[model samples]
Target: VNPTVFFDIAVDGEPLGRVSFELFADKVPKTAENFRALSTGEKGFGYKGSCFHRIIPGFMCQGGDFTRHNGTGGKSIYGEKFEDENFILKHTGPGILTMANAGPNTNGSQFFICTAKTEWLDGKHVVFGKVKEGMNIVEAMERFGSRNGKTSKKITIADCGQ
Candidate 1:
């Protein structure tokens, strides 16, 4: 079954909660596959125990940089990198899941969830899915420490998939 995917999260080493996603397999199969593999650790490709390294209350909460915790170093399952799916799922509301990239076709292990409508980012990032649930936890993340939007401790993805 093509059930929705989820990434359970922790904040400052506690069970904060989970966030879910709907893969746009039809439009962005490769990108979706990349994220799914990372989330499920398929072939050692998940975001388990990775921290949300960056956050901005008015913008997006970003993470999945498993290799390095400072907004650098993460890999697509393919190796080196993969091109952006450039899916049409726009970032017009909260909790939208997307792949983070440096430039065109630079998708890798980094990603984010929108805290508010960010329509300006509409074609800048590949919108893979929406937050199926746990936006309160997302809000809680926003206030997890709330120092100009940086967390006191990293908000981590404790687990992915079921």
Candidate 2:
């Protein structure tokens, strides 16, 4: 597996910063492919203004719903099953990107980035990437008001392949 995958994010026309992720291609090939498609816009990752709708302080941020008004949807053109539990990457620390799923084999195109260390989510999600850069941006953006007392901040991926 490669040690990193370089990418960037923006919010409302403002350049947040550059970001990179340590990819576990071997463990989560399908999830990795899904992420690649989204990032490159080959599968419409940021076609709309999808904002980080849910954020849990010191936990994880959830976003990517195409059905939402913002246009960040998870319905992929390529149907792939969720990585098996044994092959799924562990969500052990901050910056880890995990494949979001509704149930077994329900993974479409939703994922979350861990802003803090969370060991309890170990085998529950398929962690495919780790943010190596622009973590500060993620932390700063994850500050909107949510039900968890921590507000939900909207972090949008402005331009990826550009």
Candidate 3:
């Protein structure tokens, strides 16, 4: 069975709500494990207090840069980066969870949850999970997004756990 994880969100210090995800561990074990450990924080490095630095309305919201709140930093539990597990999963529609990378196999802790279909990224990003709950909060997040992916307000994962 796949493990479910959650994130308690806070927008600019105000409580937003929680978002849960069901990881596709059965199909993408490697990628799933990376997110699971990061959420649990057993390694002393996790998504707690991490902010969703990029938000694109009608697209996706990106985060998991626990090292640097901005878009330029973050690392996987496997090290700085990990290889692309597989592209069996597709960016079919909203709520899909995918790895964010610099190019090819540069996946780190950074990830994104789609708010709409992003088929163009099917081969480029690894889809390892999907939102299990809190679609409302994800909708709320879209309001803060801009064309350039910068958020108008700070959206943070105030707490996270398995």
Best by TM-score: 3
Off by more than 4 A, model 2: 1-7, 44-49, 67-73, 80-88, 148-153
The residue pairs found clashing in candidate 1 are 38-45, 38-46, 41-46
Q: Would you list the C-alpha lDDT of every candidate in the order shown? A: 0.79, 0.64, 0.93
Off by over 4 Å in 3: none
TM-score of 3: 0.98
- The digit string of per-residue lDDT tens for model 3 on 1-162 reads 899999999999999999999999999999999999999998999899999999998889999999978978998998668899999999999999999999998999999999999899999999999999998899999899999898888999989999
Error of 1 at 115 (Å): 0.8
Global CA lDDT of candidate 3, please? 0.93
Q: Any idea what lDDT model 2 has?
A: 0.64
TM-score, one value per model: 0.90, 0.78, 0.98
For all candidates, the clash counts are 3, 9, 0
Which portions of model 1 show Cα errors greater than 4 Å? 1-3, 145-149
- Output the number of the lDDT-best candidate: 3
